[PDB]
Amino acid sequence: MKTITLYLDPASLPALNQLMDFTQNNEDKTHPRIFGLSRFKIPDNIITQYQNIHFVELKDNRPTEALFTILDQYPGNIELNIHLNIAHSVQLIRPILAYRFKHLDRVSIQQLNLYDDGSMEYVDLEKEENKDISAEIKQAEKQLSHYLLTGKIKFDNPTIARYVWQSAFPVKYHFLSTDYFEKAEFLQPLKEYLAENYQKMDWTAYQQLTPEQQAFYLTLVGFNDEVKQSLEVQQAKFIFTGTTTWEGNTEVREYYAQQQLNLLNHFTQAEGDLFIGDHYKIYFKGHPRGGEINDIILNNAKNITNIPANISFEVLMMTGLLPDKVGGVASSLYFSLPKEKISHIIFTSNKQVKSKEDALNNPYVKVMRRLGIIDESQVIFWDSLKELGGG
């Protein structure tokens, strides 16, 4: 009997957790492993160190049929150890369930480990607030066994179905926010249901491996030493989160570059409304699709250190390199940050947000406010901040 470990995720957070799982087990050079991590390319010089390592593409949050080609290489008795994105768990496991049903005597499912995509799960559960959660769980289970038996996916509550895997297999869930499940009242049937099967996502796994495995992990995540060392200086650190353009009544891109510099100045300058203090080392996390706007900010801000697109907040949290403060333009990414680290989040104008009021009704914002992670005074609409000088 062979165990085969499958690592599947179209997003980022589950993949980061699963690359950590691989890193921890990396002394084992031959354990059969199948990677379907859409955002991460494992280096050739890492791959050639392993035997029985496979790669599968995901198309619409589901591995392609090349997955069966891989499994066929393993005749005889197999048990599958599967790691999944929670939000997409139904689509992701699909081909796995289909393969199992053609080999019921040979192939079983050993364990599922599921991790949060991010804020999405929480924003989705909020939509389920006026339902009888207890009866929703019971139906989801019946519809899950029907999916296992026939392959027919039809869930009355796709969101709740993400949390019923235990009706069928051993499962361990890893949550960004266990407080949400323990404090959201409509969710109590679910909390008591998940019983011994959930845990708070751990961010300290990195601190416990060998220095070689740490290096290995930094490599898996594409974290160059240059940026890492800069994030290690012994000084207060602040990250400004950048953006592109917004509804500012102009196609003049320069205007958006100048205004973001003014928003940064509100954190950076003693005269600014959001002043963080004179002793903070400043960093910049520009929008990936920032281009030349990232260029102006970088060239017109004083000693600001740029952080490249691949080093996400999730990457910093996994390696313990998250700065002391994070502030700037709003992104759902702020959902993952510990409370003590969030300073101010500023929302620019678009179709969904035309004011602070609208900003407070943003989905991920509403759940952070419910959780006590940010106060409404930390939420700011962009044009409420004055223009600061130059000197």
Short mmCIF file of all heavy atoms in Angstrom, two decimals, residues 128-174:
data_model
loop_
_atom_site.label_atom_id
_atom_site.label_comp_id
_atom_site.label_asym_id
_atom_site.label_seq_id
_atom_site.Cartn_x
_atom_site.Cartn_y
_atom_site.Cartn_z
N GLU A 128 -24.71 33.67 4.55
CA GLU A 128 -25.51 32.55 5.06
C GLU A 128 -26.09 32.84 6.43
O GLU A 128 -26.68 31.98 7.08
CB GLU A 128 -24.63 31.27 5.14
CG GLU A 128 -23.97 30.88 3.82
CD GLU A 128 -24.99 30.74 2.70
OE1 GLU A 128 -26.08 30.17 2.96
OE2 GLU A 128 -24.70 31.21 1.57
N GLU A 129 -25.94 34.09 6.86
CA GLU A 129 -26.42 34.48 8.16
C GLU A 129 -27.90 34.26 8.47
O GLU A 129 -28.21 33.95 9.61
CB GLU A 129 -26.03 35.92 8.48
CG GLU A 129 -26.39 36.32 9.89
CD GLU A 129 -25.38 37.30 10.46
OE1 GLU A 129 -24.85 38.13 9.69
OE2 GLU A 129 -25.12 37.24 11.68
N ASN A 130 -28.85 34.42 7.53
CA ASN A 130 -30.24 34.16 7.96
C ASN A 130 -30.79 32.78 7.62
O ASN A 130 -31.99 32.62 7.37
CB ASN A 130 -31.25 35.20 7.45
CG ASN A 130 -30.78 36.61 7.67
OD1 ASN A 130 -30.57 37.35 6.70
ND2 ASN A 130 -30.60 37.00 8.93
N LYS A 131 -29.91 31.78 7.61
CA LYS A 131 -30.32 30.41 7.36
C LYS A 131 -30.26 29.61 8.65
O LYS A 131 -29.60 30.00 9.62
CB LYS A 131 -29.40 29.76 6.35
CG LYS A 131 -29.17 30.64 5.19
CD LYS A 131 -29.29 29.87 3.96
CE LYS A 131 -29.49 30.80 2.81
NZ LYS A 131 -28.80 30.20 1.64
N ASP A 132 -30.97 28.49 8.67
CA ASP A 132 -30.94 27.58 9.83
C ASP A 132 -29.69 26.72 9.54
O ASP A 132 -29.75 25.78 8.76
CB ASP A 132 -32.21 26.74 9.84
CG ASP A 132 -32.23 25.70 10.95
OD1 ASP A 132 -31.17 25.18 11.33
OD2 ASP A 132 -33.31 25.36 11.46
N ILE A 133 -28.57 27.04 10.20
CA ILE A 133 -27.29 26.39 9.88
C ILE A 133 -27.29 24.90 10.17
O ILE A 133 -26.80 24.09 9.38
CB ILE A 133 -26.10 27.15 10.53
CG1 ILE A 133 -26.08 28.60 10.00
CG2 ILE A 133 -24.78 26.43 10.23
CD1 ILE A 133 -25.99 28.70 8.46
N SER A 134 -27.90 24.53 11.28
CA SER A 134 -28.09 23.12 11.61
C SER A 134 -28.73 22.27 10.48
O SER A 134 -28.28 21.15 10.20
CB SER A 134 -28.99 22.98 12.81
OG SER A 134 -29.38 21.62 12.88
N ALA A 135 -29.82 22.76 9.89
CA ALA A 135 -30.45 21.99 8.81
C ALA A 135 -29.63 22.10 7.52
O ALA A 135 -29.65 21.18 6.69
CB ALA A 135 -31.88 22.46 8.56
N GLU A 136 -28.90 23.21 7.35
CA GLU A 136 -28.06 23.34 6.16
C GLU A 136 -26.93 22.30 6.16
O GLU A 136 -26.63 21.73 5.11
CB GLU A 136 -27.52 24.77 6.02
CG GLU A 136 -28.60 25.74 5.52
CD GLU A 136 -29.13 25.45 4.10
OE1 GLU A 136 -29.51 24.30 3.72
OE2 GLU A 136 -29.19 26.42 3.33
N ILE A 137 -26.34 22.03 7.33
CA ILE A 137 -25.27 21.04 7.47
C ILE A 137 -25.78 19.63 7.12
O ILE A 137 -25.13 18.89 6.36
CB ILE A 137 -24.69 21.07 8.93
CG1 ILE A 137 -23.75 22.26 9.10
CG2 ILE A 137 -23.99 19.78 9.29
CD1 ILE A 137 -23.38 22.50 10.59
N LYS A 138 -26.95 19.26 7.67
CA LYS A 138 -27.56 17.96 7.41
C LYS A 138 -27.84 17.71 5.92
O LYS A 138 -27.62 16.60 5.44
CB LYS A 138 -28.87 17.80 8.20
CG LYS A 138 -28.69 17.78 9.71
CD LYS A 138 -30.05 17.65 10.41
CE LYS A 138 -29.97 18.02 11.87
NZ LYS A 138 -28.74 17.43 12.42
N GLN A 139 -28.33 18.72 5.19
CA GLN A 139 -28.61 18.56 3.74
C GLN A 139 -27.33 18.45 2.97
O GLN A 139 -27.27 17.71 2.00
CB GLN A 139 -29.29 19.78 3.12
CG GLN A 139 -30.77 19.80 3.14
CD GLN A 139 -31.40 18.87 2.14
OE1 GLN A 139 -30.94 17.74 1.96
NE2 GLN A 139 -32.47 19.32 1.48
N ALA A 140 -26.35 19.26 3.35
CA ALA A 140 -25.07 19.28 2.67
C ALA A 140 -24.44 17.89 2.70
O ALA A 140 -23.88 17.42 1.70
CB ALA A 140 -24.13 20.36 3.33
N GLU A 141 -24.55 17.20 3.84
CA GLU A 141 -23.99 15.85 3.98
C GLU A 141 -24.62 14.84 3.03
O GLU A 141 -23.92 14.05 2.41
CB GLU A 141 -24.17 15.36 5.41
CG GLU A 141 -23.54 16.23 6.46
CD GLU A 141 -23.67 15.58 7.81
OE1 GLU A 141 -24.79 15.15 8.14
OE2 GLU A 141 -22.67 15.47 8.54
N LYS A 142 -25.95 14.86 2.96
CA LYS A 142 -26.72 14.01 2.06
C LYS A 142 -26.34 14.34 0.61
O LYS A 142 -26.17 13.44 -0.22
CB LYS A 142 -28.22 14.25 2.30
CG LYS A 142 -28.62 13.86 3.74
CD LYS A 142 -30.11 13.74 3.90
CE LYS A 142 -30.47 13.32 5.31
NZ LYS A 142 -31.55 14.20 5.85
N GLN A 143 -26.15 15.62 0.31
CA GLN A 143 -25.80 15.96 -1.05
C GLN A 143 -24.36 15.63 -1.37
O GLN A 143 -24.06 15.38 -2.52
CB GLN A 143 -26.18 17.40 -1.37
CG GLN A 143 -27.65 17.48 -1.51
CD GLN A 143 -28.20 18.86 -1.52
OE1 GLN A 143 -29.33 19.06 -1.93
NE2 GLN A 143 -27.42 19.83 -1.07
N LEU A 144 -23.48 15.63 -0.36
CA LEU A 144 -22.07 15.19 -0.51
C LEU A 144 -22.04 13.66 -0.78
O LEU A 144 -21.36 13.20 -1.70
CB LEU A 144 -21.24 15.50 0.76
CG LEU A 144 -19.77 15.08 0.82
CD1 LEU A 144 -19.08 15.51 -0.47
CD2 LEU A 144 -19.09 15.70 2.06
N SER A 145 -22.79 12.85 -0.03
CA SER A 145 -22.71 11.41 -0.32
C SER A 145 -23.25 11.16 -1.73
O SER A 145 -22.65 10.37 -2.47
CB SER A 145 -23.43 10.58 0.73
OG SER A 145 -24.81 10.75 0.59
N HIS A 146 -24.33 11.85 -2.11
CA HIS A 146 -24.83 11.69 -3.49
C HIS A 146 -23.72 12.05 -4.52
O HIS A 146 -23.54 11.30 -5.49
CB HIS A 146 -26.11 12.50 -3.72
CG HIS A 146 -26.80 12.17 -5.02
ND1 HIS A 146 -27.43 10.96 -5.25
CD2 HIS A 146 -26.93 12.88 -6.16
CE1 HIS A 146 -27.92 10.95 -6.47
NE2 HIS A 146 -27.64 12.10 -7.05
N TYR A 147 -22.99 13.16 -4.33
CA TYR A 147 -21.81 13.54 -5.16
C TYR A 147 -20.81 12.36 -5.16
O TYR A 147 -20.33 11.98 -6.21
CB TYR A 147 -21.11 14.80 -4.58
CG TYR A 147 -19.84 15.32 -5.28
CD1 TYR A 147 -19.63 15.13 -6.67
CD2 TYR A 147 -18.87 16.02 -4.56
CE1 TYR A 147 -18.47 15.64 -7.31
CE2 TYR A 147 -17.71 16.54 -5.20
CZ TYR A 147 -17.52 16.34 -6.56
OH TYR A 147 -16.39 16.91 -7.15
N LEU A 148 -20.50 11.77 -3.99
CA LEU A 148 -19.53 10.64 -3.95
C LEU A 148 -20.00 9.41 -4.72
O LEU A 148 -19.19 8.71 -5.33
CB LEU A 148 -19.20 10.19 -2.50
CG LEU A 148 -18.50 11.16 -1.53
CD1 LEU A 148 -18.59 10.68 -0.06
CD2 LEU A 148 -17.08 11.31 -1.93
N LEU A 149 -21.30 9.18 -4.70
CA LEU A 149 -21.92 8.01 -5.32
C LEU A 149 -22.18 8.08 -6.83
O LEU A 149 -22.10 7.05 -7.51
CB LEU A 149 -23.25 7.69 -4.59
CG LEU A 149 -23.29 6.71 -3.36
CD1 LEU A 149 -21.91 6.40 -2.68
CD2 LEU A 149 -24.25 7.26 -2.32
N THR A 150 -22.41 9.28 -7.34
CA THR A 150 -22.86 9.48 -8.73
C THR A 150 -22.05 10.48 -9.54
O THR A 150 -22.07 10.47 -10.77
CB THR A 150 -24.34 10.02 -8.70
OG1 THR A 150 -24.37 11.29 -8.01
CG2 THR A 150 -25.30 9.03 -7.97
N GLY A 151 -21.36 11.35 -8.80
CA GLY A 151 -20.56 12.42 -9.37
C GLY A 151 -21.41 13.66 -9.63
O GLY A 151 -20.93 14.65 -10.19
N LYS A 152 -22.68 13.60 -9.25
CA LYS A 152 -23.59 14.72 -9.45
C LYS A 152 -23.47 15.78 -8.35
O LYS A 152 -23.75 15.55 -7.16
CB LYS A 152 -25.05 14.21 -9.56
CG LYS A 152 -25.41 13.46 -10.87
CD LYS A 152 -26.93 13.22 -10.92
CE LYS A 152 -27.47 12.89 -12.33
NZ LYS A 152 -27.60 11.42 -12.51
N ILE A 153 -22.98 16.94 -8.77
CA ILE A 153 -22.81 18.09 -7.91
C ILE A 153 -24.05 18.97 -7.97
O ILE A 153 -24.36 19.59 -9.01
CB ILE A 153 -21.59 18.96 -8.34
CG1 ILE A 153 -20.33 18.09 -8.35
CG2 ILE A 153 -21.43 20.20 -7.42
CD1 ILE A 153 -19.11 18.75 -8.95
N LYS A 154 -24.79 18.99 -6.87
CA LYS A 154 -25.91 19.89 -6.74
C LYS A 154 -26.05 20.08 -5.25
O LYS A 154 -26.50 19.18 -4.54
CB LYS A 154 -27.21 19.35 -7.37
CG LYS A 154 -28.48 20.28 -7.29
CD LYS A 154 -28.28 21.73 -7.79
CE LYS A 154 -29.48 22.62 -7.36
NZ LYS A 154 -29.16 24.07 -7.17
N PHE A 155 -25.55 21.21 -4.77
CA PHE A 155 -25.69 21.54 -3.37
C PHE A 155 -26.62 22.71 -3.22
O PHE A 155 -26.43 23.75 -3.86
CB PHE A 155 -24.35 21.96 -2.75
CG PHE A 155 -23.36 20.85 -2.58
CD1 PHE A 155 -22.36 20.66 -3.52
CD2 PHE A 155 -23.47 19.96 -1.51
CE1 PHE A 155 -21.41 19.63 -3.37
CE2 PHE A 155 -22.53 18.92 -1.34
CZ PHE A 155 -21.51 18.74 -2.30
N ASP A 156 -27.64 22.53 -2.38
CA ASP A 156 -28.51 23.63 -1.99
C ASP A 156 -27.71 24.78 -1.34
O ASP A 156 -28.13 25.93 -1.41
CB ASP A 156 -29.52 23.15 -0.96
CG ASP A 156 -30.51 22.18 -1.55
OD1 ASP A 156 -30.35 21.75 -2.71
OD2 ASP A 156 -31.48 21.83 -0.86
N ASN A 157 -26.59 24.48 -0.69
CA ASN A 157 -25.81 25.53 -0.04
C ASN A 157 -24.35 25.20 -0.29
O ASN A 157 -23.71 24.52 0.50
CB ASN A 157 -26.14 25.57 1.45
CG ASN A 157 -25.63 26.82 2.13
OD1 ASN A 157 -24.54 27.30 1.82
ND2 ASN A 157 -26.42 27.35 3.06
N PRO A 158 -23.81 25.68 -1.43
CA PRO A 158 -22.42 25.43 -1.80
C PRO A 158 -21.42 25.87 -0.76
O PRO A 158 -20.41 25.22 -0.59
CB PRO A 158 -22.27 26.18 -3.12
CG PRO A 158 -23.67 26.14 -3.71
CD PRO A 158 -24.50 26.46 -2.47
N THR A 159 -21.72 26.96 -0.07
CA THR A 159 -20.85 27.49 0.98
C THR A 159 -20.74 26.54 2.17
O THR A 159 -19.63 26.23 2.57
CB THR A 159 -21.37 28.86 1.43
OG1 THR A 159 -21.26 29.74 0.31
CG2 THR A 159 -20.54 29.45 2.51
N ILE A 160 -21.86 26.06 2.71
CA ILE A 160 -21.84 25.15 3.86
C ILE A 160 -21.24 23.77 3.48
O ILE A 160 -20.58 23.11 4.29
CB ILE A 160 -23.30 25.03 4.45
CG1 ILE A 160 -23.72 26.40 5.02
CG2 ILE A 160 -23.41 24.02 5.61
CD1 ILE A 160 -22.99 26.81 6.31
N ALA A 161 -21.43 23.39 2.23
CA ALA A 161 -20.92 22.12 1.76
C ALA A 161 -19.37 22.07 1.89
O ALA A 161 -18.77 21.00 2.02
CB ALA A 161 -21.38 21.92 0.31
N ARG A 162 -18.72 23.23 1.91
CA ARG A 162 -17.26 23.27 2.04
C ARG A 162 -16.80 22.74 3.39
O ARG A 162 -15.63 22.42 3.54
CB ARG A 162 -16.74 24.73 1.91
CG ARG A 162 -17.09 25.42 0.60
CD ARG A 162 -16.82 26.92 0.64
NE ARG A 162 -16.85 27.55 -0.68
CZ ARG A 162 -16.93 28.87 -0.87
NH1 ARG A 162 -16.98 29.69 0.17
NH2 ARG A 162 -16.96 29.36 -2.11
N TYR A 163 -17.74 22.60 4.34
CA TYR A 163 -17.41 22.26 5.73
C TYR A 163 -17.98 20.93 6.24
O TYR A 163 -17.97 20.65 7.44
CB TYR A 163 -17.87 23.46 6.61
CG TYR A 163 -17.21 24.78 6.23
CD1 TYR A 163 -17.81 25.65 5.31
CD2 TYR A 163 -15.95 25.14 6.74
CE1 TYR A 163 -17.20 26.82 4.91
CE2 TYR A 163 -15.32 26.34 6.34
CZ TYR A 163 -15.96 27.18 5.42
OH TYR A 163 -15.41 28.38 5.00
N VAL A 164 -18.40 20.10 5.30
CA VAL A 164 -19.04 18.83 5.62
C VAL A 164 -18.23 17.59 5.19
O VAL A 164 -18.74 16.45 5.24
CB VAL A 164 -20.46 18.79 4.96
CG1 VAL A 164 -21.08 17.51 5.26
CG2 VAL A 164 -21.37 19.87 5.57
N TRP A 165 -16.97 17.81 4.83
CA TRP A 165 -16.14 16.72 4.34
C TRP A 165 -15.96 15.57 5.31
O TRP A 165 -15.73 14.42 4.88
CB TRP A 165 -14.78 17.24 3.90
CG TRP A 165 -14.89 18.11 2.70
CD1 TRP A 165 -14.75 19.46 2.68
CD2 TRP A 165 -15.17 17.70 1.35
NE1 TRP A 165 -14.93 19.93 1.40
CE2 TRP A 165 -15.19 18.88 0.57
CE3 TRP A 165 -15.41 16.47 0.72
CZ2 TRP A 165 -15.44 18.87 -0.81
CZ3 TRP A 165 -15.67 16.46 -0.67
CH2 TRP A 165 -15.68 17.65 -1.41
N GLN A 166 -16.07 15.89 6.61
CA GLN A 166 -15.92 14.92 7.69
C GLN A 166 -17.04 13.87 7.63
O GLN A 166 -16.88 12.78 8.17
CB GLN A 166 -15.82 15.62 9.08
CG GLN A 166 -17.16 15.88 9.80
CD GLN A 166 -17.12 16.94 10.91
OE1 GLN A 166 -17.92 16.87 11.85
NE2 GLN A 166 -16.24 17.92 10.80
N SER A 167 -18.16 14.15 6.96
CA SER A 167 -19.20 13.11 6.87
C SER A 167 -18.68 11.94 6.05
O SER A 167 -19.26 10.86 6.05
CB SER A 167 -20.46 13.65 6.18
OG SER A 167 -20.19 14.16 4.88
N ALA A 168 -17.57 12.15 5.36
CA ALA A 168 -17.05 11.14 4.46
C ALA A 168 -15.63 10.72 4.68
O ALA A 168 -15.32 9.57 4.42
CB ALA A 168 -17.17 11.65 3.06
N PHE A 169 -14.76 11.63 5.11
CA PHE A 169 -13.32 11.31 5.23
C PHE A 169 -12.74 12.00 6.45
O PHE A 169 -13.40 12.84 7.04
CB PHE A 169 -12.51 11.87 4.04
CG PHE A 169 -13.07 11.59 2.69
CD1 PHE A 169 -13.64 12.60 1.93
CD2 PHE A 169 -13.05 10.29 2.19
CE1 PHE A 169 -14.15 12.31 0.68
CE2 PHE A 169 -13.56 10.00 0.94
CZ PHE A 169 -14.12 11.00 0.19
N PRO A 170 -11.54 11.56 6.90
CA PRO A 170 -10.85 12.19 8.04
C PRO A 170 -10.42 13.57 7.46
O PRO A 170 -9.90 13.65 6.34
CB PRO A 170 -9.64 11.31 8.24
CG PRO A 170 -10.14 9.97 7.86
CD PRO A 170 -10.97 10.23 6.62
N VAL A 171 -10.56 14.62 8.24
CA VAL A 171 -10.33 15.94 7.71
C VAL A 171 -9.77 16.81 8.80
O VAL A 171 -10.04 16.59 9.99
CB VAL A 171 -11.73 16.53 7.22
CG1 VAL A 171 -12.62 16.81 8.40
CG2 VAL A 171 -11.59 17.83 6.49
N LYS A 172 -8.92 17.74 8.37
CA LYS A 172 -8.36 18.75 9.23
C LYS A 172 -8.46 20.06 8.43
O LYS A 172 -7.93 20.18 7.32
CB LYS A 172 -6.90 18.46 9.60
CG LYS A 172 -6.38 19.41 10.64
CD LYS A 172 -4.87 19.23 10.98
CE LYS A 172 -4.15 17.98 10.40
NZ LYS A 172 -4.30 16.71 11.20
N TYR A 173 -9.18 21.01 9.00
CA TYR A 173 -9.35 22.37 8.47
C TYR A 173 -8.34 23.35 9.16
O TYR A 173 -8.08 23.25 10.37
CB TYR A 173 -10.77 22.85 8.77
CG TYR A 173 -11.88 22.15 8.02
CD1 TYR A 173 -12.53 21.03 8.57
CD2 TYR A 173 -12.30 22.61 6.76
CE1 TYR A 173 -13.57 20.40 7.89
CE2 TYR A 173 -13.32 21.99 6.08
CZ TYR A 173 -13.95 20.88 6.65
OH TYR A 173 -14.95 20.24 5.96
N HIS A 174 -7.79 24.30 8.41
CA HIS A 174 -6.84 25.28 8.95
C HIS A 174 -7.46 26.67 8.63
O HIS A 174 -7.49 27.09 7.49
CB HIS A 174 -5.44 25.05 8.30
CG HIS A 174 -4.83 23.70 8.62
ND1 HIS A 174 -5.09 22.55 7.91
CD2 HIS A 174 -3.98 23.33 9.62
CE1 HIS A 174 -4.43 21.54 8.44
NE2 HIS A 174 -3.75 21.98 9.48
#
